[PDB]
């Protein structure tokens, strides 16, 4: 059902070329799913009722070929001990096909490992079920409009190049960037994206069971927007909007309501510079950005990239096309 929107300008043609040269291919997903099934079978030995779920770029439609696999383990402090036991089991019995399994401290503790057969790393979290939901909510947004997936990919590639795309380093997480892209598409004068949670609350409700969650996108009809902007024009609008137009200090990005919402007066949101509302739980996906240096770096980089793209309507100004 993939459809490529009409390209009038050179920048839009280049964005489509990047989308075609970096679009996650079916083979990559297959290697990831194969590993997920074997890992689930291996853990099921440790926890008979456990279920291993692939979440993130791999299944939300915004993946790239170099994109790593994200695993969510579901079981019927509990998460901490279970993750440590999984890491130990991974070292003791699975050393043959798992390379250098690594336990990394984070808000959501995960285990980083590499599949030797597929040459693909994996990040596994235990019981962070909200990720399963946002994966398929994001997947629905990804295929709702033809320009969503290419635009997300060029912005994701652009951010990673300028080293503003790492939550561990204090910059924007890929989830936050995606949400920032979706919000821009939602709040345009001609709306490109609606609010899936508002329009179809039944489909994305927290009550739906996890195994029933992945079914939300198939049952949702597509959206036709009146926007006539090209991919390059949309990229420039997004770069201009987050560089000069969006007020980080006074506003919070909410994809849940499909509109900018004033920051809550409570103490959790007050300190933070960048406010992005997770649709399922009321938390900040931009919580990693906590340093003024990192915050200033992101803002200056957004404006710099917007400037260079305006002067030269070429992707090379902000993103190098040397590798393709």
Author numbering: 146 to 221, 233 to 480
What's the paper's own text on this?
Germline development defective 2 (GLD-2) is among the first reported cytoplasmic non-canonical PAPs that promotes the translation of germline-specific mRNAs by extending their short poly(A) tails in metazoan, such as Caenorhabditis elegans and Xenopus. GLD-2 proteins from different species have various lengths, but share a conserved nucleotidyltransferase (NTase) region composed of a catalytic domain and a central domain. Different from C. elegans GLD-2, mammalian GLD-2 is an intrinsically robust PAP with an extensively positively charged surface. Whereas C. elegans GLD-2 prefers adenosine-rich RNA substrates, mammalian GLD-2 can work on RNA oligos with various sequences.
To understand the structural properties of the NTase region of mammalian GLD-2s, we determined crystal structures of rnGLD-2131-484 and mmGLD-2143-484 at resolution of 2.5 Å, and 2.7 Å with Rfree of 24.3% and 27.1%, respectively. Additionally, the two constructs also contain mutations at catalytic sites (D279A for rnGLD-2131-484 and D213A/D279A double mutations for mmGLD-2143-484), as the yield of wild-type proteins was too low for crystallization experiments. Crystals of rnGLD-2131-484 and mmGLD-2143-484 both have two independent copies in the asymmetric unit. Superposition of the two rodent structures showed a root mean square deviation (rmsd) of 0.52 Å for 322 aligned Cα atoms. Compared to ceGLD-2, mammalian GLD-2s are featured by apparently shortened N- and C-termini, as well as the absence of a ceGLD-2-specific insert in the central domain. The N-terminal portion (residues 1−130), which is not conserved between mammalian GLD-2s and ceGLD-2, did not significantly influence the PAP activity of human GLD-2. The fact that mammalian GLD-2s are intrinsically potent PAPs and stay in a constitutive active state suggests that they may not need GLD-3- or RNP-8-like partners as in C. elegans to stimulate PAP activity.
